[PDB]
Amino acid sequence: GAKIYAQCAGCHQQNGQGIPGAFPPLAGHVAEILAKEGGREYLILVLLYGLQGQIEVKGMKYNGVMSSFAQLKDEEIAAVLNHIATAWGDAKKVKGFKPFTAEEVKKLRAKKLTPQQVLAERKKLGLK
Amino acid sequence: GAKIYAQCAGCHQQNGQGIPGAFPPLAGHVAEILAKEGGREYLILVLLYGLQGQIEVKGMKYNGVMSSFAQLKDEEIAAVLNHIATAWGDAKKVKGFKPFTAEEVKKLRAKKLTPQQVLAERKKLGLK
Numbered sequence A, B: 001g002a003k004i005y006a007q008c009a010g011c012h013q014q015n016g017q018g019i020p021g022a023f024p025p026l027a028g029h030v031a032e033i034l035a036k037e038g039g040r041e042y043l044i045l046v047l048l049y050g051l052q053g054q055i056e057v058k059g060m061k062y063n064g065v066m067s068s069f070a071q072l073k074d075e076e077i078a079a080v081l082n083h084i085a086t087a088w089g090d091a092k093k094v095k096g097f098k099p100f101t102a103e104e105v106k107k108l109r110a111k112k113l114t115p116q117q118v119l120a121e122r123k124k125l126g127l128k
């Protein structure tokens, strides 16, 4: 569950800062997405389905593509999330959130959505 | 050594297409870089140090960026390095063609370059 995050070095970087300019800050930014309910739903989504479509995160906008892995077993995922949700301080800031879990992960394979579909649900939540 | 290449959801893809404005295609596309006197180090630089800038993709120009695959060890890095290499029929073109002697690397591990910099070494070899 951090080893995973490691399987592809780069993208969102060992630091969570990822690498601003091309990948957004998971860095702490995961909280603000983890606050706003469903968020921990939006996140689940992302790795399973993929996301795309110009977006703004901490003002610097992005527009790129990010793939889904949706291969990693509900397990495999389930983790490399409470990992990016804690492993730079976030389970912190955010209220004692219930961690992640696999049934919830297959609970969504269902959804069987798309890179845009997915943005749509990032729309639902907004910002500031 | 291709399992590695695998750790990466999306990216240059598997059919190794990659995808306009985003990630250029290596499938096919790597016949060329090898057929120069660096094409073969460089890859290591690309891989090793990062790459940033618009460039020619047997047609398109991307403005994308490529994180550094810093983190991986030496061996692993000649693996994929031998994979994108072989995987989509490119070495099946190139002469006195060799395996990414997991050494050919510690060999070019130094320069301590940088994205634009290797963006440089690119256009040195002679491209766009």
Ligand code: HEC
Binding pocket: A005, A008, A010, A011, A012, A022, A023, A024, A026, A029, A043, A046, A047, A051, A052, A053, A054, A055, A056, A057, A062, A063, A064, A065, A066, A067, A080, A081, A084, A122, B008, B009, B010, B011
């Ligand atoms: C691995 C090689 C990659 C690549 C190429 C990208 N990511 Fe991700 N990513 C994650 C989350 C939660 C988001 C959303 C952030 C938000 O909504 O504010 C992102 C988003 C992206 C984008 C932005 C999409 C766009 O519209 O342009 C891009 C380009 C992107 N990523 C690329 C989460 C993660 C991970 C967490 C488990 C992992 C691993 C990755 N991303 C990996 C990659």
Ligand code: HEC
Binding pocket: A008, A009, A010, A011, B005, B008, B010, B011, B012, B022, B023, B024, B026, B043, B046, B047, B051, B052, B053, B054, B055, B056, B057, B062, B063, B064, B065, B066, B067, B080, B081, B084, B122
């Ligand atoms: C996964 C983490 C990724 C992501 C997001 C990208 N790559 Fe690579 N890549 C490789 C090579 C040889 C090139 C360029 C070849 C040439 O110069 O013609 C690329 C380039 C990119 C770019 C474009 C670069 C730019 O600055 O515009 C981008 C956006 C990009 N990649 C994304 C080689 C490889 C690999 C070979 C071993 C691997 C693995 C990856 N790339 C992985 C990723």
